[PDB]
Amino acid sequence: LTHKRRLSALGPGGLSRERAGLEVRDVHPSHYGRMCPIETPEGPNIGLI
Amino acid sequence: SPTDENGRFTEDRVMVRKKGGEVEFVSADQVDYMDVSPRQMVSVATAMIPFLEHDDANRALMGANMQRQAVPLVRSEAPLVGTGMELRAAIDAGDVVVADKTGVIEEVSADYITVMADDGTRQSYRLRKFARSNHGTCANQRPIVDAGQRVEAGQVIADGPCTQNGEMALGKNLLVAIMPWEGHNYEDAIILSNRLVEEDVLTSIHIEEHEIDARDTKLGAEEITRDIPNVSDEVLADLDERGIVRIGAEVRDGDILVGKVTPKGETELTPEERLLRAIFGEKAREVRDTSLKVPHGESGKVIGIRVFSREDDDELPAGVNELVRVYVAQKRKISDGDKLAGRHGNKGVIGKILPVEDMPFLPDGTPVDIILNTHGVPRRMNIGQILETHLGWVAKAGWNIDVAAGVPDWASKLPEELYSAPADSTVATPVFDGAQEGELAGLLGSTLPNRDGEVMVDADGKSTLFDGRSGEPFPYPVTVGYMYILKLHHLVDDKIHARSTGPYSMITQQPLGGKAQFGGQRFGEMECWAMQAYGAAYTLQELLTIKSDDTVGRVKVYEAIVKGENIPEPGIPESFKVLLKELQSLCLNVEVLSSDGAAIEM
Amino acid sequence: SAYDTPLGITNPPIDELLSRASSKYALVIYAAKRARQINDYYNQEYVGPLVEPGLQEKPLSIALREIHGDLLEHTEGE
Amino acid sequence: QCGLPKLMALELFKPFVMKRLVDLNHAQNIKSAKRMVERQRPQVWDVLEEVIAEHPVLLNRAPTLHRLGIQAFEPQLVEGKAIQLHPLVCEAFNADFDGDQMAVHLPLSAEAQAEARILMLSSNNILSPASGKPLAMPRLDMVTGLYYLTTLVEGATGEYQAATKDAPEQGVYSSPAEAIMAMDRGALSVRAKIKVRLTELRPPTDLEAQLFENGWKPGDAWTAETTLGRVMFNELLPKSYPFVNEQMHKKVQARIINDLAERFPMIVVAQTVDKLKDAGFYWATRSGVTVSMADVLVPPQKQEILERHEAEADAIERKYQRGALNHTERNESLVKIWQDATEEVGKALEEFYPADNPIITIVKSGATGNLTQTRTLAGMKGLVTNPKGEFIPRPIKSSFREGLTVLEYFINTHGARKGLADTALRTADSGYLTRRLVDVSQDVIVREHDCETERGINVTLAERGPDGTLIRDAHVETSAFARTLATDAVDANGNVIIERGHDLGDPAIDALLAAGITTVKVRSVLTCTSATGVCAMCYGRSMATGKLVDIGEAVGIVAAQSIGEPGTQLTMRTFHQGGVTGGADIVGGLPRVQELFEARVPRNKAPIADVAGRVRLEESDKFFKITIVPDDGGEEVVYDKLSKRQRLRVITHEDGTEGVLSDGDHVEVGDQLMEGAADPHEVLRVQGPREVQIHLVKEVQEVYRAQGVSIHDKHIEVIVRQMLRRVTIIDSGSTEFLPGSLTERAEFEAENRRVVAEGGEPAAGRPVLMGITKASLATDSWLSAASFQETTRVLTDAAINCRSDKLNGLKENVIIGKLIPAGTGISRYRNIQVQPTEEARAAA
Amino acid sequence: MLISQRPTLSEETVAENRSRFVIEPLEPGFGYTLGNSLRRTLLSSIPGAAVTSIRIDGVLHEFTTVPGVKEDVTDIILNLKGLVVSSDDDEPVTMYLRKQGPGVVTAGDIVPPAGVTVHNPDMHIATLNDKGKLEVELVVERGRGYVPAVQNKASGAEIGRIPVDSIYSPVLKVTYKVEATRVEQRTDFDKLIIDVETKNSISPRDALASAGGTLVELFGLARELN
Amino acid sequence: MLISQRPTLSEETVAENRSRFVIEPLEPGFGYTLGNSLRRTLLSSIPGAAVTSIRIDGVLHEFTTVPGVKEDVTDIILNLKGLVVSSDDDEPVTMYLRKQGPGVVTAGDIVPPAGVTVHNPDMHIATLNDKGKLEVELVVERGRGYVPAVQNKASGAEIGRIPVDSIYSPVLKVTYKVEATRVEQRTDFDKLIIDVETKNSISPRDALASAGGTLVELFGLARELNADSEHIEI
Ligand SMILES: [Zn+2]
């Protein structure tokens, strides 16, 4: 159920493989009410997914 | 934000979010909008963690992600204390069968459910039994309706792989005592009662899918047969006529699953091999055994075989004739090293499973199921687990709030529906609007007595536990309750690994990597620095040469070990030999000298 | 000195062995050489064990007990 | 010991098991034994027990930051599949039992087994190599038990009380056995005060000097006023150890273990720590430490404090509205106010909690946690940071006991999300510096015992101060401790206390303080005159074992690892890509250490006095002007471009308290005029090689001390030595030294003294300070040089010279495949010849 | 003062399968240890009877379903694990449970051989619809404690045999309480009350007697000394 | 049901009155079942004689010190509590200790009544000073275990009758531990190590024999409820 509702920043036409710096993978205030700040994978995609 | 019956705010100042995302306090006449509910920010998984107020963001993240790694158990059980989301999330996932139209259950069976709709239409729902999921977990469904029962439209008629009565049941709720115990729960370890092993509380079914095929080769096509060469009847007793293991037979690592043979090339027997052919009357054949076998450290019972072949018009990869897939299922109990965790991010590994008589037990004789160390709760800032423990205890044993002299001051905010409840009465506590500290503290003192009429747990949530081994009562009361914990998919059965000798990579000559390839462990540069700091020259030398890309030395050491000879000394690797040869090729007269200015050696 | 009986590979005590060699590094090679001699003898000109061997003690343990017993001598290679 | 799974051990020892199976006739050939092992027949388990005995195995957990990351254990078979690890080594491995894995390696050769059994055994590595303090000591649960056992509480059952009419002393017991018997009946509490007759516990030294002037012996009975728990604890310690009689806070246990390390052999320390582990677990089980919300007390003064500070926050807001403040200034003022509020709330919470409450008992005993976590759990969360890293003016006034609101939780998630990336990025800089340090000092090995040098460095031990008691220097434990004296130490009467070459241990420092001598002269790696490597005597005590360093120690790599391991605790440059350059604000941490080790000109340079003399000081619109007139010299010196933004150096005498440097003051050569960092090159030019090395060591240790890291000065000295090993030639005389070339100082001096045919015609040259990078980028070995530089040039130059390479570079040996020239690999030990004695051989 | 008064034990019933035994008087501090020892012996080493394996006609392994049966084989086995039986002979015995047509199959439909008793016929085994035919053969043995399922290969049994976990334990829940006594004017001696509840196989008195016999045999080793 | 293997009891001597008994191999879990029971039986079952009260003639309320002797009243009480006394009376008995003149007074100077024996006459009691004397009377009676000094609050016939703690049990110290041992390919079997330190009046072997007899005696009560109920047999 949680896989079907993912929002992935990585992928073709998204952001470059080597440009996924710590700045993009952060909790912006606009996430409130439309993206959960707690749930995210523990892998290398922390914040990117 | 508090509001009146009409909806008007009852406070002069309200907390609001403004343009820059800044949170501030503004007058009641400046607000423009409000959130529909407190659960607006959280997601589906995060919405299923009770008392989410009291858990830090990091531990909430860990718990939310660990909920996604729970393995379905043989019998699911809904949590005593949970959230209202667990119902909806169960239905929206889709794994539960819901009756499309109102009607009567004409016939019910393990395999299918037949429903006769009120309008005369008939529906049939086939349940998927022991189906292997993408990750090896069992997706077994089971019906929850009786023949002749009436079902409304949208009602759940069959439980999913991991739900009870159509609501999420990712784990089991069991009795926990919060105390250190002889150091067996030291450093986040966990102690379990042997009951959980005897009653199959945490047992789970795991299914593995092995695969093989016969392909066309430059010497011809491979073949699947039962007549594989050079094997005793003790090995292939359980193979069918087609050469595939019979369904229902149990297999252990090394057992043959599918008998397969491949054509070989020129033989050119050695004189010894020719002598062996002569002394055993071995008639010439040109096939070699390549039969599929159970991988190292795997076992179970065969539950299904699926076979494809292009001769039956089935689509196959180019240059392939037949393909076989075998399903092996096993029933893994909980064992040492298996990873368990709660919903609040508290996780550990089972360091010890104690006999039932050794566990601390309540005054009425009930032994506790799990013991969690006290030192792990405070510093991790995940005290929500203690809230869950207390509320689970309150739920397991019913409660009754007295109203003889009016509702208690702490019960004013409680809805009337919570003024009483029987034993095993499940409760719901939403993430951001649930049981308060005062309400829970008041409820803890209103629990019903036990069978004998004596309350086990006092108003503080603590009980006087007895020592299972010594028999003396523990000097101080110990926090006791019911916690919902779940079995993660990090089982030790698929993490243990070992290697003495095995395959080697052709490109770089080093041992392969990974458990699947039967590879060796990495020895990085930092490990070399540590070994140098120890001054262990010989160990480092043998690690870098004998246990690494040195074929001659490797074979010599293996021979010495097997024959009992002392390990031969190493020296002069091939890389240095070729470097010296190149240096000579450059007309540089390189030579190696012994001692402080002595003659050459070899 | 007063100390409980050592267990396993802690017998003989490490300090007593360091008191009978130039340094721990020298002790390592000393014991390794004696163990190699014992193993070579068991494979059949070396003297063989000098102390009463246990049921299945490894050559290195025998070498270490012999060193502790002052039954061996060595010369620095420098 | 360690627990090894049966299935894993069988695979690891397969060939040995096959050999033993064939030997015992269970298998007729190697192939049959191989099949038996693969198929796991019943008999292989009987042979595995015989094979595994006394065969050590190495346990490792990557990453290996320090040498104790790999340790040898004696394996024993256990059921199941999870490895069993001794708790006391967890701190060494940085491992917790929440899902961590570990790797096991099997030594094969006899030399490898001996090395694992002797050098790498866990019981031999009690003390950490970075500072010599014990590492395998009680922790977490084990502390809480021992803290509970030795605690004294008034009013306990059966406690001691004095005599009274018709009643003698009421709480006196004739022996520990009687006290235990009384405790079993519930008449006496283990934590109650009693007077007990002890006969096998040595009395305290101060009490021993009185009660037994002839010296205490076993069996002598003395009456001790103590608690039964303390008597029980003191039985775990060695028999000869004096009775302690103190509450066992983690610091006290560390002190006791340190004292045991000095006075007793390592085996006794291992046994004592095992006994302490057992007792600590047993009494932590029964200490009653449990967590419930009834125990999470909230102070009753939180409300008053919060409104009191809310009033001031409202005052700040009112002033901002009136136009007296800017946005950033208002935010800073609010942050100040709320930090004060959090501080007072924390103090109130600390005061309120009872001494026996589990939540605060866990912290105060030092077993786990800190008071900040307790305040966050109960008092209030406090302030949180934006995604940019700046504090939000409005704090989280709620506590996790109460439960954060929606907005508070959302703003709190920012720091939690940031930390995940921050921790990952923190390791890169530490690894960079660690690799630099390892490269510069990999092959610094102890080559000889004594260099017979009289030179050294002076270290201060204490200040006799204004009172009648001298105060121990705070830096003594990392400056003078574990050194070797270069010259005799004499008391006020000239009586020698410690001989030259003795190790300055804790008893030695205590005795030195007893005589009141404040400073001593210690041999150092900096002043060691050994041509190659360093000598054992100058390095002195080995931190890991406490004994004089053995010939062949790999001191350089140990120092590099010790310096690099704590690099993650230092502050770093900001990880954000945007913003202005970060040099405006002094980030005095890892950047400062990197600047020092590279010998680069500081960005906050301050001048130093080239000549000792009196100072005439003038001021201008934007520049300072400082002139020094040498009192015993001639011409003055002038510095007339010092930026006025930089403040003048403060001197601040004890009572004179000069404060900022004034005109007419006196400054000696090497003194610093302006606040900032002195240029290492200027220090070298003014004072010489000795003072620049002292300056570098002081500067590095200053940062490491300020950031809360403790490293012995000798580790830093090992690195600093490599930086100043070359001398640049300015003019050559009667020797073939080319001008402008860099030569090793040893070779330079050797050539100058070798020119003897006409006496000396010295070639002129002066020392040059190099960064660790450039110093590491040079070597005397051509086989090693061929891996860094143009291989063709190196090979041609070596060929024309016909010069041989002696295989001493360590980094060079690993190319050959020959064992490293350190530890057991040096020729001094590699060629040992072993022969049984004639008297021992006679038994044959 | 020394008292020659001897301890004594008296039992009192609470239900059919629950009893309470009072032992008094005991030396001070001696009650808890005795009660804990009795509890451990009762929970660990009381002989009983249990099922060892099952054979269902229409299945070859437990990961399957029987046509017309609501429960799958795993559910049937987990339900059977709750069956408590009493056996008279040490060697294994066989029992048969056969039914056809719709209805609920319970433990009362099992036909035991001579010397075997089923003590809970009301337990639910399965439920069959109109097309359901159920045939089960159960093996019963004597033993004590928990014995995990024996592999077919180890026992040499043919395919179709489904080994199951065996739990040889009649005891269900045991606890104890301690009080003071009015012994003469000493008034500090202990009184032990041990409460025992057992599964319906055997009465609490027999279980307590078995525990006492085990403990007597084990302490005979200490008594052996002169 | 027969046990897998009959456990054996070995003994080792650690001192003149100290022993260590090893019971092995035991069925898994029975080590803890046996250890605590044996310890408590040893420390609370064997009867013995002890001093329960002492009256000194030279002091009424100045308990701090007694003239003519350097030992405090507390030291006198402790030394007398260290006395090892045995009797076959089963009733309180009065013992008189009187000495005069400077010198060491020991337990050997005592004059026990008929049927009372002092096992450690060499124990030091006090050191008498010049012009000094000592005169005390001890009440000795039998009992079990350790009884805290009974307070004679109602004593009217005497005020100087000091009550003291009574160590009746001949066994002074007992400590048990449980370890794991391996038989066949199973390592769940237990080993019980029990260390016993006793007075001079009884050897540890006799104390252990009496404890075993008492425990068999006590569990006979439970066994006799139904003697034919099947137990694990050895
Ligand atoms: Zn030197």
Residue numbers in the entry:
A (entry chain C): 440 to 488
B (entry chain C): 537 to 1138
C (entry chain E): 24 to 67, 74 to 107
D (entry chain D): 440 to 1283
E (entry chain A): 1 to 226
F (entry chain B): 1 to 234
Show the paper's wording:
Indeed, HelD was shown to remove stalled RNAPs from DNA, thereby recycling RNAP and the template for subsequent rounds of transcription.
However, in us-fork–HelD–RPc-II, the presence of the HelD CO-domain keeps the β′-clamp swung out and the primary channel widely open. In us-fork–HelD–RPc-II, σAN-helix, wrapped around the HelD–CO domain, would also direct the σA N-terminal domain outside the primary channel, which is occupied by the HelD–CO domain itself. However, the σA N-terminal domain would be close to dwDNA where promoter nucleation occurs, and also close to β′-NCD. The us-fork–HelD–RPc structures show that HelD can dislodge rifampicin and DNA/RNA hybrid from the stalled early initiation RNAP complex while σA and RbpA remain on RNAP and keep contact with the DNA promoter outside RNAP. This process would correspond to backward transition from stalled early initiation transcription complex to us-fork–HelD–RPc-II (gray dashed line arrow toward Fig. 6b).
